[PDB]
């Protein structure tokens, strides 16, 4: 009888809730009460990157901290040089509906995806100097929402069919499939050690996955709406979430709980992107009210505002050395702050 | 001094003892100064912001630039008849720049036609054709006119063209043709507005629709330059009303252009707010 199984599930949920209530001895605010505030963070725009003909949906920084790639709805990928504001490559795409962009850690390949349900890998450093398609990863039954590189031969992707997959580029076949999400998966973040990753879907839940075994380790709840963005803490023992309820939250892996909420009464719009600082003290979130807010991750206080865009901010990322921040928006521009 | 009504005067007007000349010249000076200030503001507005760039912004900007230059030259060198070399040069510069302003005024109506009759856009770009027309029409007209008679570029009363030998028609005629074309274009535009205002919001109070139409017509009259027809009817002291209407509606043209295309538009105001 399924009733006994439902009772077992309810009993396990109650046991988990009791354990979590037992573990909660003090809040993060009380502990970080006497820490001096960061102050006022005033950032100015240093570079403006123009040339896209439509709304910009995704971007990714390079490991060398100089080159970045952006995706637009005109059906083109552009690779820029931030230092000199120069276009290195322009890659026409077969499908005009692009929602994701990724940059390889070694800088040899670039991934792309969208409504075509395919992920394509482009070889930048090829013979004769003509960027060409190297692979087309097919096997998903929904639109591709995110994709991250592990190395030159492994890529993890998420789709709207409530599944995530691990691919072998040289073969083109899924090595592992991560199932268990109810809603469509929207975000994806890789741990610094590249042995775990966290995912967020439209079921207001987040899950911790093991890349090796291929199972779900923990499930985090608390949001009241869909989750759009997710990011990992610099050390790797915590992660932050961004939802449509105009709130951001911080979860701890070891305590299996929530630690702080980042919300204000004057903010009613949902979060589209989230990112962290090199040391972790600053949390950056992008909103669709044409604005971006900087938070104090330890005291949950606003510290600054990045108001330069005249349309919705869709993408956001912080460079590896922590020197600059690049934001993309629906106005077809990229601005670099410092 | 001299008033603004000498530009459109195919006859030598005799003035009876009175206050008409002084009032007309005072109105000319005040209107041209305030129009120069407003035109400078409009030029900065149209050239600075990159979110306002289009195929009509270029026409607006070139019209404002030409009007500014022409009115500055008018205020500087229209009473310099005591200089035997400067005066013809001043007259020629005034001729060229006023003709350029009128060419861009005609391009405004051509843009209206290209917007309302042929709805879709073109495969090529029309900017080069705009720049060719609006700067090659005045050059050709002034060059041909100076080739025939070049001693007619100075008058004993003002630095303008001669009247006795029909040399003023080299400026008057093209303006009349442009005005007729703009009248045709405005009639077509108003007919389209009336016909297609019964499709969108088909049923509404007749008063508000008339208010919208008259406001649109007022906005378009500053760019079409149809208020230059008053000067054609100023022939003697009996029709002194035409001179007043000409100098009142035309010396304040920059003010109207500013009011209608920089302060009652939401895009310009939101750009200025962005600068705040």
């Amino acid at each position: 009888e399924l009733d006994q199984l439902r009772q077992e599930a309810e009993q396990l949920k109650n046991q988990i809730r009791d354990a979590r209530k037992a573990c909660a001895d003090a809040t993060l605010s009380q502990i970080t009460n006497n820490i001096d505030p960061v102050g006022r963070i005033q950032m100015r725009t240093r570079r403006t990157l123009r040339g896209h003909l439509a709304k910009i949906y995704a971007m990714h920084w390079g490991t060398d901290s100089r080159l970045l790639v952006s995706a637009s709805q005109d059906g083109k990928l552009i690779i820029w040089d931030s230092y000199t504001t120069n276009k290195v490559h322009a890659i026409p795409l077969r499908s005009s509906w692009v929602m994701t962009c990724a940059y390889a850690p070694s800088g040899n390949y670039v991934a792309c995806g969208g409504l075509d349900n395919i992920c394509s890998i482009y070889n930048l450093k090829t013979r004769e100097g003509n960027v060409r398609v190297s692979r087309e990863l097919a096997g998903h039954t929904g639109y591709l929402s995110c994709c991250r590189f592990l190395d030159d031969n492994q890529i993890v992707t998420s789709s709207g069919d409530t599944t995530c997959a691990l691919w072998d580029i040289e073969t083109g076949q899924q090595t592992t499939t991560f199932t268990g999400h109810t809603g469509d998966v929207m975000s994806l973040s890789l741990a610094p050690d590249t042995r775990l990753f966290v995912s967020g879907a439209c079921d207001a839940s987040a899950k911790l996955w093991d890349v090796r075994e291929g199972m779900c380790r923990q499930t985090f709840t608390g949001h009241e709406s869909d989750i759009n963005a997710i990011c990992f803490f610099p050390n790797g023992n915590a992660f932050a979430t961004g939802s449509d309820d105009a709130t951001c939250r911080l979860f701890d892996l070891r305590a299996d709980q929530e630690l702080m909420t980042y919300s204000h009464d004057n903010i009613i719009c949902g979060i589209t992107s989230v990112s962290f600082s090199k040391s972790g003290r600053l949390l950056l979130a992008g909103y669709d009210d044409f604005n971006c807010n900087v938070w104090d991750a330890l005291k949950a206080d606003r510290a600054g505002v990045l108001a330069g865009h005249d349309n919705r901010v869709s993408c956001l990322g912080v460079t590896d050395d922590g020197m600059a921040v690049a934001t993309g928006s629906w106005d077809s521009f990229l601005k670099i702050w410092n | 001094m001299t008033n603004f009504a000498i530009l459109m005067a195919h006859r030598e007007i005799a003035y009876k003892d009175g206050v008409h000349e002084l009032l007309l010249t005072v109105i000319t000076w005040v209107g041209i100064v305030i129009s120069l200030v407003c035109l400078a503001i409009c030029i900065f507005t149209f050239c600075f912001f990159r979110g306002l760039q289009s195929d009509r912004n270029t026409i607006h900007k070139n019209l404002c630039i030409n009007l500014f230059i022409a009115e500055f030259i008018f205020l500087i060198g229209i009473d310099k008849t005591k200089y035997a070399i400067a005066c013809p040069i001043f007259a020629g510069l005034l001729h060229f720049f006023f003709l350029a302003a009128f060419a861009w005024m005609c391009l405004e109506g051509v843009q209206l036609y290209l917007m309302l009759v042929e709805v879709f856009e073109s495969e090529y770009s029309r900017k080069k054709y705009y720049y060719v027309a609006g700067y090659l029409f005045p050059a050709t007209v002034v060059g041909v006119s100076a080739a025939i008679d070049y001693k007619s570029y100075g008058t004993e009363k003002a630095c303008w063209l001669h009247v006795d030998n029909y040399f003023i028609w080299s400026f008057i005629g093209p303006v009349t043709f442009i005005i007729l074309l703009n009248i045709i274009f405005l009639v077509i535009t108003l007919c389209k507005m009336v016909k297609h205002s019964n499709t969108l919001k088909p049923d509404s109070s007749r008063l508000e629709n008339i208010k919208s139409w008259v406001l649109g017509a007022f906005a378009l009259l500053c760019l079409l330059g149809l208020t230059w027809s008053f000067g054609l009817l100023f022939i003697n002291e009996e029709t002194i009303v035409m001179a007043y209407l000409f100098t009142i509606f035309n010396a304040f043209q920059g003010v109207f252009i500013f009011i209608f295309h920089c302060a009652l538009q939401k895009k310009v105001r939101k750009e200025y707010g962005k600068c705040f």
């Binding site: 199984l5 299996d256 003290r281 | -």
Partner: protein
């Protein structure tokens, strides 16, 4: 059914783990932030002589 049994199995797997105190986690986060504070160019502005932008 199979789906309910699988859900029960996953819940049992997630219900038996070693959880640490919240205060310990907060202290660890603060310690990391204080230890890596000097290497954050966004937290501490740097002179323009060393700024690539």
């Amino acid at each position: 059914i199979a789906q309910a049994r699988k859900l029960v199995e996953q819940l049992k797997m997630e219900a038996n783990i070693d959880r640490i105190k919240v205060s310990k986690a907060a202290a660890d986060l603060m310690a990391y932030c204080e230890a890596h504070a000097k290497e954050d160019p966004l937290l501490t502005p740097v002179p323009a002589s060393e700024n690539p932008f």
